[PDB]
């Protein structure tokens, strides 16, 4: 990774002396990144999930997992076990490289970009964000886009509180408005 080097060098020290931490593992870490795609339009055409999954593979660089309806839901014509989404869990080198890609190419490519909310913390130091469109990523080609599919991005951390989560995500200059 490249941003793990930045974490280990700068972010730990700055957060240590900002939060009066006893031990270096009391400092929040970024432990995993999860990217999913709600592709319930698969109900109509399976080909959809396949194309959404290939988009996700292009974005993330690892093959996604096809996720299934946990139940049968009468409001969307889905049975228990019908595939309606994808997911990739990135940890380590791949998640750090994705963090840099998203921070330094992807988010500048969002229409009308004016910062990401800092109230989007789940309550325990985990941040989630959406991506109306996928072209925001340079890994997806434009003159071939079959459909306009967004995605969700969640950053699970060891930060016990939203404050410690913002603090860590800010050390990387995460664009918070």
């Amino acid at each position: 990774a490249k941003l793990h080097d930045y974490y280990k060098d700068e972010v730990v020290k700055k957060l240590m002396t900002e939060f009066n931490y006893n031990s270096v593992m009391q400092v929040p870490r970024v432990e995993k990144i999860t990217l999913n795609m709600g592709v319930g339009e698969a109900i109509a055409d399976k080909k959809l999930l396949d194309n959404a999954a290939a988009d996700l593979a292009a974005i993330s660089g690892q093959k996604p997992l096809i996720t299934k309806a946990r139940k049968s839901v009468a409001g969307f014509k889905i049975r228990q076990g019908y595939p309606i989404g994808c997911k990739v869990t990135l940890r380590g080198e791949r998640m750090w490289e994705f963090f840099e890609r998203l921070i330094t190419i992807a988010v500048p490519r969002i229409r009308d970009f004016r910062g990401l909310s800092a109230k989007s913390f789940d309550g325990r130091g985990n941040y989630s964000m959406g991506v109306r469109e996928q072209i925001i990523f340079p890994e997806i080609d434009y003159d071939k886009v079959d459909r306009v599919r967004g995605l969700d991005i969640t950053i699970t951390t060891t930060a016990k509180s939203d404050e410690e989560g913002r603090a860590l995500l800010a050390a990387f200059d995460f664009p918070f408005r």
């Binding site: 660089g61 093959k63 840099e100 500048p108 004016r114």
Partner: protein, 60 residues
């Protein structure tokens, strides 16, 4: 990671308009040329009234 199931994830090059070059692994195959990066976007660097409107046309 598993074998032969993953997209070809090779280190590419990516050059911005303001002269920013980042050596990035991604699954595109070719190199990258992008208009705006994190270091030349209005929000990242911090670049993102009726009495005046009335008085612009109203030099007394």
């Amino acid at each position: 990671m598993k074998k032969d199931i993953h997209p070809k994830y090779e280190e590419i090059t990516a050059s911005c308009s303001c002269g920013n070059v980042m050596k990035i692994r991604s699954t595109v195959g070719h190199d990258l040329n992008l208009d705006v990066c994190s270091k030349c976007h209005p929000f990242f660097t911090g670049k993102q009234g009726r009495v005046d409107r009335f008085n612009k046309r109203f030099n007394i």
